[PDB]
């Protein structure tokens, strides 16, 4: 009879496991993940429907001090993610004590204390040496939050968190139909993000942060083969050379890894063509940002 529905923002500094947590809460990979401290750049909605209850999760960019136009967009994305939700999941890395970036998040959540439930989720319990001490320090930054320690990779602990969040949703009609996709994004966007993820993990120094991607063509082909053409943009000529690599070895590595992940997630054959292009300092180009989808 009755139905419950709400939004849950997932926030925290970069690299704590926010996107990993979302994918595991949903049971399907919808968000890019990488070991680099600036992977997510735009809010991403993950739709969880369980029985008569629905949660629209909002993954967000890691909170940080903006350095350029892209950073400003990202900062605005976090701010807007926190404007109207029914609960907030603040993810922290239990492997170390709070950093100034974590304190930045605690500060951003103060106005929500007492207004919306805040769950302080300590992540990476599996790799933390001093989980308890770390968790205690994080909690002192926002005493009002409900603390818990887990690994976003642990099925049982994540399922427990999911149950606790569903019980917090207010009565109301579902925001999305119960048969809606697991995330609110186009197939093209999802593919471009998978490619960016594989690129970021295989590039170093400043290059990962200069990478943007876009799918320009998707089409049925060959013998049940899905054809995909995508562009990997960089900000400068020296980066293009490095992404391509000696004899095109680097871009081939990236392309192969992306094709294989795509085939494993889609369960079908994929033929992927990649082209590397320079989009002149696009992170500072308002027009470029709009073309690339970082619009607002
Ligand atoms: N050992 C361990 N690693 C984890 C866990 N959860 C996430 N990670 C790792 O932490 C890194 C960052 O995870 P990710 O989900 O991209 O973090 P994020 O908070 O979304 N980063 P950003 O804000 O930049 O988008 C990845 O290498 C990921 O595999 C966990 O429970 N245990
Ligand atoms: Mg992320």
Swiss-Prot record:
Stored Gene3D superfamilies: 3.30.300.20, P-loop containing nucleotide triphosphate hydrolases
One cellular component (GO) term of this entry: plasma membrane
Segments for region (G2): 38-42
Membrane topology designation: Peripheral membrane protein
Domain KH type-2 as annotated: residue spans: 203-280
Record protein name field: GTPase Era
Complex formation: Monomer. Binds to the 30S ribosomal subunit, between the head and platform, contacting the 16S rRNA. Contacts ribosomal proteins S7 and S18 and may contact proteins S2 and S11.
GO biological process terms, semicolon-separated: ribosomal small subunit assembly
A GO molecular function held by the record: GTP binding
Region described as G1: spans on this chain: 12-19
Nucleotide-binding keyword on record: yes
Protein source organism: Thermus thermophilus (strain ATCC 27634 / DSM 579 / HB8)
Keywords per UniProt: Cell inner membrane, Cell membrane, Cytoplasm, GTP-binding, Membrane, Nucleotide-binding, Ribosome biogenesis, RNA-binding, rRNA-binding
Similarity comment: family membership: Belongs to the TRAFAC class TrmE-Era-EngA-EngB-Septin-like GTPase superfamily. Era GTPase family.
Encoding gene, per UniProt annotation: era
């Amino acid at each position: 009879e009755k139905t419950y529905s709400g939004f849950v923002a997932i926030v925290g500094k970069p690299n704590v496991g926010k996107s990993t947590l979302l994918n595991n809460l949903l049971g399907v990979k919808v968000a890019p993940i990488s070991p680099r401290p600036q992977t997510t750049r735009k809010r991403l909605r993950g739709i969880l429907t369980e029985g008569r209850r629905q949660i629209v999760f909002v993954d967000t960019p890691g909170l940080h001090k903006p350095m350029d136009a892209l950073g400003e967009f990202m900062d605005q994305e976090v701010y807007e993610a926190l404007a109207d939700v029914n609960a907030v999941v603040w993810v922290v890395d239990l492997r170390h004590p709070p950093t100034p970036e974590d304190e930045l998040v605690a500060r951003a959540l103060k106005p929500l204390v007492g207004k919306v439930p805040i769950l302080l989720v300590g992540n990476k319990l599996d790799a933390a040496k001093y989980p308890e001490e770390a968790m205690k320090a994080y909690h002192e930054l926002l005493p009002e939050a409900e603390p818990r320690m887990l690994s976003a990779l642990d099925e049982r602990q994540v399922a427990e968190l999911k149950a606790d969040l569903l019980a917090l949703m207010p009565e109301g009609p579902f925001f999305y139909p119960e048969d809606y996709a697991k995330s609110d994004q186009t197939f093209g966007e999802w593919v471009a993000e998978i490619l960016r993820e594989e690129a970021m993990k295989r590039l170093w120094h400043e290059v990962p942060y200069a990478v943007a991607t876009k799918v320009e063509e998707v089409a049925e082909r060959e013998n049940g083969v899905l054809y995909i053409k995508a562009i990997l943009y960089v900000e400068r000529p020296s980066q293009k050379a490095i992404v391509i690599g000696e004899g095109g070895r680097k871009i081939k590595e990236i392309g192969q890894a992306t094709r294989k992940q795509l085939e494993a997630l889609l369960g079908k054959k994929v033929y992927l063509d990649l082209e590397v292009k320079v989009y002149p300092d696009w992170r500072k180009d308002p027009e470029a940002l709009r073309e690339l989808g970082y619009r607002s």
